[PDB]
Design a binder for this molecule. Structure first.
Ligand SMILES: CS(=O)(=O)N(Cc1ccco1)C[C@H](O)Cn1c2ccccc2c2ccccc21
Ligand SMILES: CS(=O)(=O)N(Cc1ccco1)C[C@H](O)Cn1c2ccccc2c2ccccc21
Ligand SMILES: CS(=O)(=O)N(Cc1ccco1)C[C@H](O)Cn1c2ccccc2c2ccccc21
Lengths: 472, 476, 475
């Protein structure tokens, strides 16, 4: 009995029911990964390095194979005498299609195919069945449906030496050269001058962050949402969203640990669904997207309102490169490109600026940039959020003033836009109003070193509010 | 020329605003301001429902001022710092306010009047938050507020007829008085959003209680229509004039009952509000037990765990937990529901200080102004204003009489929806098999009742009897 | 059965239940301290703690193993190299310690190692106090005392590790032990130790136990020692001071508690002492209880127990405060004693903390807490952050001139720690900028040259800061 587990998401040894089932009764086990901005690639490679290091602790290794799954697996079936193939289920339409092709190939070759749901809290198809064959398109209806779902089963036991037992991994002395985790440089990325990631990849990092997150949520929040402060825009050591997207952290483990901690602090009380809002919003979008192959499109998407967005390549590139001339917007887009995560409030600000608020550019162009740059931009959640914020499905931020109340000194701007550090707080959000003398001392002339504002926000927002009303 | 500022704090309305009307008279310019401190001393999100309501009151005020070719000025800061700069910057000669009877408000307004006088600025103050000039009620009573509602009603009966509402502010009232405006008004003086103020808005849905005068007047008309066959949030913020409410009630009675001498019970909600305001205005410790001269000193139990269970809707009594859940989620609960949970915390079941119930209500209740909140909690706990012993509300049986199926419980406590009506108010009595059918195990998914109500109420009734026997020996 | 006991705090052989359990049924025992190469005085105190442990372990035919590195890297190698089956630690309630220990516990589980954890840094299991309170820490000392009074009696101190306790258990040792596992020098940690004088606070369990006996002898001569007054201690370090030894674990708090009861029973001939007898230990326990579940206890933002105050960011003023260059001799003398010796009187802590925060400079208490963490020998994370929040009004304005003049009228304490000021008469030593030039000339200290001018006007600064605090407390 030769077992292979195929990692795609679920890049972890904890709560991996497909991997545990695959090892059961197996003589041999091999785990494979078969191989977007530089930050996303880097995070992925660090997840794989961490997987390899943790498999080494079990006297195993990760097998990274370059090629296409349809080509690689038939050769692997014969070469490794594979009797069992396991995957974590992928609900996303492109993933479902690819997995159906591999399942047929494996089944025809006499390979047992193990598929287990562990990327989401629930079986999304069962939610859709409870709703009469269509996904819920409102969060309240989704929550009503979740309330009627069966209590979630406990997380699978972590893959340990005891679980592996006598199952072994055949290895060669040339493993690193033939199956090693590639570097960014091997993939052709220019890494000259790249600094260390603000978001280290991998399950080990994810699990330490989960423990910190639970401790602050239970005792430092009384299980409530705390107020935002100046530093809330900066990457948190408790942030989990990239780890949930790549599968370094099980959403089911998070759910159980959160419930158990609530039960300890609130004796024998069951928590309100608001306690799981981040996980539930994530499920809602996965459920909405699973049967819609055009979820990320306007045309051909039955749930999306068709709106005549402008085509403006110059405006879009300015937005994407953080050259709008509004430092608050430009600072966010700069943090997005440099680090791969920005706060939800920051996402709303720049998405509104691009779509309904200022530039009137399609939400698809905003989604594609976020897809390249955001570590936690799962296809379903990214597309659904952009449609939601643009008033394109599911039924105005000032680009100058909004940030100042929580960040009056403009410390966030200064962190990410060094060209503006010379400006006093009076002008840091609106430097085009700084006198020439201030610009000269700051060594930043507006229109020269830093661009003038690309639009008049008051006039642009007014026209766009009118356009949205006329559409609706 | 004559530059006038009207300072909004309460009185968040253009109808029946005599201070604003007097301020416009003889003015070349008028600017309306609300002063908001953007600094938050706490990390908690718990007062979000009250903040959202206030912001909607301010947005509605700004939109109505916009119809008059004006704007609302929301100024960030503290009044003592802001007003001297505004006096010089805008060349202000007149400042108007609606009177604030609360002791902290009176102290603050005396300081601003001193600042205005030192700057050569005239201060206009008009009473319009209450039906009566509270000071005249107290003077009529010999210098002290009445301590019983019956005595208060006798005083009201000897008061002069209620003042008619002031004219609504319109183009005609404003006339040639103008508001200087700038293109940067929204950046410097716009109504902030909840997110701008630092609140996390993720768990918010549509408000059940939208703020603002426009909504208040609409709800007033509906309230009168139903009565022919709740406004307290709007009254607390001044979105609705209590004097207009009084006149509308008198008019409806004159139409329906064909008399001009209505019984005072017709205005009972307004008169109870007036009564607590009168008791509070001259008492700076009115919201305290210790040091409060009108408050009976009672040795209430100290129990932080029990108080937190009451506040968080984890008592194990579904009727109580449902009310406390609606209070947290929406910011308003019915008068009878307040009686029920207030009794359970204090005289009825837990014997916890009324100060603790007031603090939770202050955080959560949209209409919990300082005077009425403190007054109501002292009243129901038998700490002051004593006229009678109260009914001990049953945390199981009271709700079942009008809502036998427990639909209110099911709305707010989804964990209990599986239970049949036989056990919906007392799920601890459901057989283990029924709990399994309900998919809710008592002691696991939903807590057991935190007290035995029959034993707790019996002891607390005895405690109250001993207390009032001690009071009669004192009084003689 | 190969057992390792990991010292972090609890640097002692008396009342060490984790170590005692670890030896029970073990064929081999190794005691380790993990050091990754904090001001000089804390490092010096620590190394003396370790030298003391090593010498006492030598009496038991053992040695201390000092291992250079990070615990997460070091332990998996030690498990394999020494075939370790058992690892023991004294419980660390502090949030960072809890995270580190959970990480090592996972490593031990992967290696098949059983982890023994015993509570002995605190009087009580802090989690039990919190459960007795319904799941939240008490937020007042009065509430904390109510809870303590209803707890089961404090555990008795465990027996000291002696040869008979060790029994047939042995410590494998090599001739190169000192070369690989010896206690490091200050130079190895990179400190320049040239010019260092003797510590006023010698580290270690041996010093702590003798100081405990002397401390009990002294309280016996004090009227109403059941109601103790720490604020009546001298400004100079006490021969019987115990607070550094409690912080590092050289002295068991449970032993101290039992000896206080015993002294009360001997002197006051009753077994029912008031809890005030244990005030020093109980205040310490209260801050540990408040902090154990709050990972942001040492921060203002995101800390539910902390009032949010808009403190100034002023690095230069902070550096003057931290380095004792404020120009106020009382403040500067305290900060100089703190830097040179590692301990200052509780009222001296009040004085400088008020000056930094609400009183004069309006700098965050978090910045003051960090300097104390570097310099103060007894600044446990819990007590340090909790005290700094209290003193900054984050849960009376001291005069930086008059408070010290009343506490030390001749100004001899100032002269001791700021020798440049020794020439000034008492009339000016607390405010030497007011000394006439002729007096400054005779003193050989010109203000603005040999000693700085005062960095703020106390009268204007305190008046403004009191106003700001009122605006905050309006909410
Ligand atoms: C109002 S919301 O439902 O849109 N929303 C707010 C919220 C938080 C908790 C509850 O609600 C959730 C959003 O998904 C947050 N977010 C994303 C997340 C991942 C990937 C992309 C986006 C993205 C893009 C543009 C705007 C926002 C976005
Ligand atoms: C118009 S009103 O708001 O003044 N009011 C009239 C009235 C009648 C008797 C006393 O007050 C209606 C409210 O239901 C009265 N009420 C309570 C009742 C029981 C228990 C607590 C409260 C409580 C707390 C905070 C604010 C109000 C409160
Ligand atoms: C408000 S307090 O005075 O009651 N207090 C609480 C307390 C602790 C023990 C007994 O009491 C504080 C103390 O007095 C004195 N102290 C400390 C002591 C150890 C460690 C750090 C500090 C520290 C830091 C900054 C200001 C002062 C400080």
């Amino acid at each position: 009995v030769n077992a292979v587990h195929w990692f795609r998401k679920g890049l972890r040894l904890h709560d991996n029911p497909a991997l545990k089932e695959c090892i059961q009764g197996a003589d041999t086990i091999r785990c494979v990964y078969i191989l977007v901005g530089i930050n996303r690639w880097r995070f992925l490679l660090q997840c794989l390095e961490d997987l390899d290091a943790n498999l080494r602790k079990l006297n195993s290794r990760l097998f990274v194979i370059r090629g296409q799954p349809a080509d690689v697996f038939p050769r692997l079936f014969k070469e490794w005498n594979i009797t069992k193939l396991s995957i974590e289920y992928d609900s996303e339409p492109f993933g479902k299609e690819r997995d159906a092709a591999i399942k047929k190939l494996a089944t025809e070759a006499g390979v047992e195919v193990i598929v287990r749901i562990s990327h989401t809290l629930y079986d999304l198809d069962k939610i859709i069945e409870l709703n009469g064959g269509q996904p819920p398109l409102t969060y309240k209806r989704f929550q009503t449906l979740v309330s009627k779902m069966e209590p979630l089963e406990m997380p699978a036991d972590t893959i340990t030496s005891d679980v592996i037992g006598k199952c072994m991994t055949p290895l060669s002395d040339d493993h690193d050269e033939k199956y090693g985790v590639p570097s960014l440089e091997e993939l052709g990325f220019d890494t000259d001058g790249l600094s260390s990631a603000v978001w280290p990849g991998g399950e080990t990092e994810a699990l330490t962050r989960l423990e910190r997150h639970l401790e602050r949520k239970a005792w430092v929040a009384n299980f409530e949402r705390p107020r935002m402060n100046a530093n809330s825009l900066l990457a948190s050591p408790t942030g989990l969203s990239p780890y949930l997207r790549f599968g370094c952290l099980s959403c089911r483990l998070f759910y159980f640990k959160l419930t158990d901690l609530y039960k300890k602090v609130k004796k024998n009380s069951s928590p309100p669904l608001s306690l799981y809002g981040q996980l539930l919003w994530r499920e809602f979008f996965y459920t909405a997207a699973t049967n819609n192959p055009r979820f990320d499109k306007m045309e051909g998407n039955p749930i999306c309102v068709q709106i005549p967005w402008d085509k403006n390549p110059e405006a879009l590139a300015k937005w994407a490169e953080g050259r709008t001339g509004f430092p608050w917007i430009d600072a966010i887009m700069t943090q997005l490109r440099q680090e791969g995560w920005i706060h939800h409030l920051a996402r709303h600000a720049v998405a509104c600026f691009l779509t309904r608020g200022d530039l009137w550019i399609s939400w698809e162009e905003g989604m594609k940039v976020f897809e390249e740059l955001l570590l936690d931009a799962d296809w379903s959640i990214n597309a659904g959020s952009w449609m939601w914020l643009s008033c394109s499905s599911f039924f105005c931020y000032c680009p100058v003033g909004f940030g100042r109340r929580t960040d009056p000194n403009g410390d966030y701007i200064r962190r990410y836009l060094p060209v503006l550090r010379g400006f006093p707080a009076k002008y840091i959000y609106d430097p085009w109003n700084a006198p020439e003398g201030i610009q000269k001392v700051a060594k930043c002339l507006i229109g020269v070193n830093y661009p003038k504002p690309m639009v008049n926000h008051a006039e642009a927002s007014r026209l766009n509010i009118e356009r949205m009303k006329q559409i609706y």
